[model samples]
Target: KPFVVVVDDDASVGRAIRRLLRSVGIAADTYTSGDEFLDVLSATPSYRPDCVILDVQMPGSNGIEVQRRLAGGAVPVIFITAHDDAGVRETALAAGARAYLRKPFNDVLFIRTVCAVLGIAAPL
Candidate 1:
């Protein structure tokens, strides 16, 4: 199974994401913060995830910062935020995020976007 890193401050949301990904045979690791994910990435250079799903609004570092870091490292990012700000969306899109999903996003769309970014068919 491919590995996915899920970053969100909400534990419930993270759990839900883990469940959803696991149901489709994708292994997901949930992190509470961008810093935690960064630490893991730093400690293990080989710990690159096939995809990254991050919330746009976080306590410490917002999703944009996370996306920027990924961009700097040439890593793929998908912004999952409840924020409806056009500027935020534009910034994320311009920074090479695979997708920018607003809160209450459709599960089908989310799955499809991930598949598209990974260049694979959605799991049946």
Candidate 2:
């Protein structure tokens, strides 16, 4: 089972993403903040995440900052945001994000991106 971590300040967003992933037979762990996500990673160094779905804007330690911290890790990152700023998207991609998607993303495309990043076939 592929495991993913989702971090967003909005509880609704995290819940929705987790539910969507679950429907595709993927397991997800969600966090309300980047710090919380990092804390979990720190506490559980053995927890290998296949990918990370992160919100661009959050209350603390924004997505890009969190991505920087994860740079040394092998996990791929996908950044999702309601704020459609070209600069931010460019920065995220340049920083090695596998994909930067705008909110209200198409479910099929999102799943495809995740599968592509994880180098696995989408569940039938």
Candidate 3:
């Protein structure tokens, strides 16, 4: 099964995403912060995830910075942000994020975005 790491400061959001992924038969791991993710990344099992769903705003090392730090790494990234400003979205897009799902997003849209990022066919 493909794996994915989801990073978000809000525990509920993380859990929601994890559950959503599971409901679609996709396995995912959730982290509370970017630092926590970095700490655990190297120890991830042999099957590295194909994609990462990261929150754009966090206490330290925001999503884009995390992307920069992981440059040339195996994982592709999709950013989730509460910030709906056009500039923020543009910045994330310019930084090569696969998608940016605004907060309070619909379940269908969120799932579809993740599936699209992972290149999974519909109905995933």
Candidate 4:
């Protein structure tokens, strides 16, 4: 099974993502705080999250900051945001985010994008 980690301040966003991935037979594990996820990351350095989804506007250590902290680490990131700030998007992209998407992204497109990042065929 494909495993994905999701970090978002909003619970609704997290739940929606979970459901979306579920329909396509993928697994999603979500976190409401960036620091919490990072904590887990450090505690389990051997555990690698194959793909990650991050929300830009978080209470602490925003998405870009998290991305920066993971710098030089071999990981694939997908950033999603309700606020579409070009500079922020550019920053995430420059930081090598596998994909950048808006909050209300199409479920089909989301699945496609995820598959593309994983180098797998889009089932939906």
TM-score of 3: 0.86
TM-score of each: 0.86, 0.89, 0.86, 0.88
Where model 4 places Cα greater than 4 Å from the true spot, the runs are 83-88
lDDT of model 3 at position 109: 86
On lDDT, the candidate that comes out on top is 2
Q: Which scores higher on TM-score, 2 or 4?
A: 2
Regions of candidate 1 where Cα sits further than 4 Å from its true position: 72-74, 83-88
Worst 10 residues of 3 by lDDT: 39-48
lDDT by residue (34-108, candidate 4, tens digit) is 878888888987766778898877766677666877667667888887755666568676778878888688878
**lDDT for predicted candidate 4 compared with the true structure:** 0.81
Candidates in descending TM-score order: 2, 4, 1, 3
Supply the TM-score for candidate 4.
0.88
Better of 1 and 2 by lDDT: 2
Clashes of each: 0, 0, 0, 0
In model 3, the runs with Cα more than 4 Å from the true position are 44-47
Candidate 2 lDDT tens digits, 1-124? 8999998889998899899998988899998878777777789879768999888777556675678888867988988878556575786757788887888788888888888888989763
Minimal lDDT window, size 10, model 4: 83-92
